[PDB]
Amino acid sequence: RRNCFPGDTRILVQINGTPQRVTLKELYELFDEEHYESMVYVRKKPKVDIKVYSFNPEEGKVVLTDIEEVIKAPATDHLIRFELELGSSFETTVDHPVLVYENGKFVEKRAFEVREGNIIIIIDESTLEPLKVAVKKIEFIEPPEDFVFSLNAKKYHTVIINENIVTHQC
Amino acid sequence: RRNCFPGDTRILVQINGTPQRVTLKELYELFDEEHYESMVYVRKKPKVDIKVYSFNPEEGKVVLTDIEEVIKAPATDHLIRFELELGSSFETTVDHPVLVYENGKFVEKRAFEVREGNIIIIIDESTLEPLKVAVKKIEFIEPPEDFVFSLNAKKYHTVIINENIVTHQC
Amino acid sequence: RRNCFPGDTRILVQINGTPQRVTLKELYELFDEEHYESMVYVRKKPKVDIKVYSFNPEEGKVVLTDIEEVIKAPATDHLIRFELELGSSFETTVDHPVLVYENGKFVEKRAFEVREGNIIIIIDESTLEPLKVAVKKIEFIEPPEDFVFSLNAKKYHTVIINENIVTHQC
Amino acid sequence: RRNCFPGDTRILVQINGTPQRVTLKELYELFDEEHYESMVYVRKKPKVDIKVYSFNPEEGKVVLTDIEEVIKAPATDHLIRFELELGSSFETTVDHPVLVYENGKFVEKRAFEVREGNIIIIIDESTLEPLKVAVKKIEFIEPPEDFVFSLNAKKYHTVIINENIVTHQC
Amino acid sequence: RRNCFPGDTRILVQINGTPQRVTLKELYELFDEEHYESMVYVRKKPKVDIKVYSFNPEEGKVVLTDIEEVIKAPATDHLIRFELELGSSFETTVDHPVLVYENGKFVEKRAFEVREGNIIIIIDESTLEPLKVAVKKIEFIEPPEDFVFSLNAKKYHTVIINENIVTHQC
Amino acid sequence: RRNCFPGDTRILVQINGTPQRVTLKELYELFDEEHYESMVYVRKKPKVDIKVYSFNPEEGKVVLTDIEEVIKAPATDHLIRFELELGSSFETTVDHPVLVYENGKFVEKRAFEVREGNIIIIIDESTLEPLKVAVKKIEFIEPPEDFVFSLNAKKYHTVIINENIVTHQC
């Protein structure tokens, strides 16, 4: 019954009697009592009357089933996020080279080595001039698009995405 | 000078004197004389006066350089696309199980084994009833989001994405 | 009790009282009631009195045991098969370049892009002249040599291949 | 011009004026002056007048070209070969368990740990009795079927296999 | 409860009432009744009163628990060890080139092909002269530093390494 | 001429006329003019008269050659280092669970989510009591043992490690 879905995939459920299509990230945020088990986040208690629409291939009938667990698997690796002055942002890999101004020179610096206060070269969208801006904040971030969600349901483990009956999206 | 970019990444160029931001898929479709070399598609002749904006870190100056080649690398694996009756579509992996109606039974069939004329079970978005629809067309497709583009430029190999000076997006 | 065997590996069994060596592909085709479960084909009902010869290392005795399931795992990726005129065939990878004649030119075309009616260049075995033949049929095929079989037996999970007692061939 | 071929693949060449189809293992054994360079065996001097048949797609003509190097890449990992008494052989992986008789017990022993003089249990093909045989010889062997060959030719790098014009078999 | 630890990692246990820090290799060698199961060595019977110190996060208390199994996983691949004359040793990979003297020539030979009696070139640490020494012994060895150990404990599966409460070291 | 060596591997060189064995990390720190090129750190200017001892297999003679570049390749992934109060340290993977005290509860927290000021549970080596200590510092660190060094030398690319003539240690 193990499956993988992107965060933005919409599946069809019944909450408080009415049916609708919720994104799997929303379905996760519709549970609580989070627990970091193994290498994933498991949520087992719902805070709204939840049921997932599945299919019974023995009787060939659309059916309701219980959402036992909702699972959120963090990204494998993470990116580095430089919040710079003048509002500009820069997300990149830890090994990607960043153009830095130091000691009157333009040098290529491994993103992992950039520190707050360092000068990044950016290029103004209006004037197309090289601008010297400072790194205000450095954050190791996991892009929501890199998360993998799973759904453990009782008995009937298939899920209804748009019009289709899908088992997983690994 | 080898790099990787998604198809939808916008880089800044000068065409016929004016500068603007074009997607790398557009930049590819702005060349011609295609050639399948090694395992990639190379386009070397431009049909519009093209130059890419890069950066000179010796003088610290934004500069124009020539786009020698634009490269398009096909997806690794491909998906199967079922065009069904009533307008519905279904894209999936060759090994994903598809709910099929055959011999009065609902069976799980490997997508690779589905044939035209087979009956797929779908679920109507309005009525939530199981519908029996027929496979009209079967296509092995490569999603545009799975293509990897590259840019070979002369001397200065960096590229200006929004405000940032990036080397690649591998 | 999970194992892997090529299709052509011969193991020793007793069918209808007599013992003999059957290939694992034959052993699979000696069952029925196929089911595509997970990502493999499982056959659980035998159509002939079947037992597999295994070994009891506690008493050190050759023994008979029941064949619960026979499993067939499809190839990972598949090849493209071009059936050409004049009887010639061509099996290759989806990314391998095929010599095509189009618009009076010999071009290298990604096998994935070849279509029925396209002209392939072949070389006659007798005369060694380049011949222009047409693609009559295009098939995505899985070579039997790429399939991986498994055997689930009761209690004693080893198998007798020629003279040897082997556990698997992963 | 880098390619990969199995040892048993037949390509078409001209030796001493006459054309014929030789296996790539034979083509390798038709050269000498072996050299272990990088992680492969290179042979550069031919001991017979050799030329390989290739294709000129500019003029669309079958052509002769020079075989600069023939390359033989050893298998990645190797197997263990037990030569046992009574003529029986056993090839397996270093981690596969071998049924051994020691101290009056049948034990599963990692193939890597088996030594000469150890007792292997085999099963006679005629009588189907368990036989105790001794390991006479232990050899770390590389199966010929696991070798990967390459051909470096001048200018025209394609090769004629049966009727087809193929670039590689990676 | 599955974990991985290097051989030299020290965990804290109580043997015969007194607590101390033992290396996981020592902890393995403190059990017996070895069994090669799957692809690992399992030891289940202790020859000394053993208990492992774990943590109870419900009561937040350091606790004793039973060591059910201790597991030792062999290295993936192995090295070749040349015992040479004059006491010198040489450990290397099966594919690494070894400088050999044969037929009055210095040749690079694949380590896998070196045989006993072959002449290796070494360089004396005192005089810095090239010395011709003979291969006396050839051994396929698994470096202790390449082994991966595991601990199966009852209920509480965490382990106390120095001052820290760690789950694994995969 | 591309090779890989651990940081602690000692190779034999001549500095200012005298020969000795320096670790490759020391050899790197004996150069300067660092440059982050591709995904590695290259040092090309020596600050001490350097030459590396290599071997000439044509004349069979130990020889001196020039060290063109010394290369340092950063670790693939990095660890998280928690500097805690009372002097204790904790290095772990970003996904490893850390025992945290929050809201009067002992919870398992993904190391990536631990913040400064959080309470870690450790276990005193003397008293074996659980101690509540605070995270003072959080550092993303690359262990020196995870770095891979390379040496580009002129003509003769082999290196003398102890008594042996080795090409690489990939």
Residue numbers in the entry:
A (entry chain A), B (entry chain A), C (entry chain A), D (entry chain A), E (entry chain A), F (entry chain A): -3 to -1, 1 to 167
Question: Which text from the study accompanies this structure?
Answer:
Protein splicing is a post-translational process by which an intein catalyzes its own excision from flanking polypeptides, or exteins, concomitant with extein ligation. Many inteins have nested homing endonuclease domains that facilitate their propagation into intein-less alleles, whereas other inteins lack the homing endonuclease (HEN) and are called mini-inteins. The mini-intein that interrupts the DNA PolII of Pyrococcus horikoshii has a linker region in place of the HEN domain that is shorter than the linker in a closely related intein from Pyrococcus abyssi. The P. horikoshii PolII intein requires a higher temperature for catalytic activity and is more stable to digestion by the thermostable protease thermolysin, suggesting that it is more rigid than the P. abyssi intein.
Surprisingly, solution of the crystallography data revealed that the Pho PolII intein precursor was present in the crystal as a domain swapped dimer. The intein structure we observed consisted of monomers opened between the two symmetry-related units, with the N- and C-termini of the inteins on the same lobe of the monomer. Residues Arg-3 to Pro71 and Phe144 to Cys + 1 are in one lobe of the monomer and residues Leu 76 to Ile138 are on the other lobe. The active site of the domain swapped dimer is compromised, making it unlikely that this conformation of the intein is catalytically competent. The thiols of Cys1 and Cys + 1 are 3.4 Å apart in the Pho PolII structure, suggesting that there could be a disulfide bond present in each monomer, as we observe experimentally and in the Pab PolII monomer. The peptide bond linking Asn-1 and Cys1 is in the fully trans configuration with a dihedral angle of 177.1°, indicating no strain in this scissile bond for the Pho PolII intein, which has been suggested as a potential means for altering the equilibrium position between the amide and thioester in step 1 of splicing. However, the orientation of the Pab PolII intein with respect to the monomer segment is slightly altered between the two alignments. However, in the case of the Pho PolII structure, iPAS is very unlikely to occur, given that there are two passages between each domain such that the N- and C-termini of the HINT unit comes from the same monomer. Instead, it seems more likely that there is an equilibrium in solution between a properly folded monomer and the domain swapped dimer, with a folded version of the Pho PolII intein with the typical HINT domain as the active species.
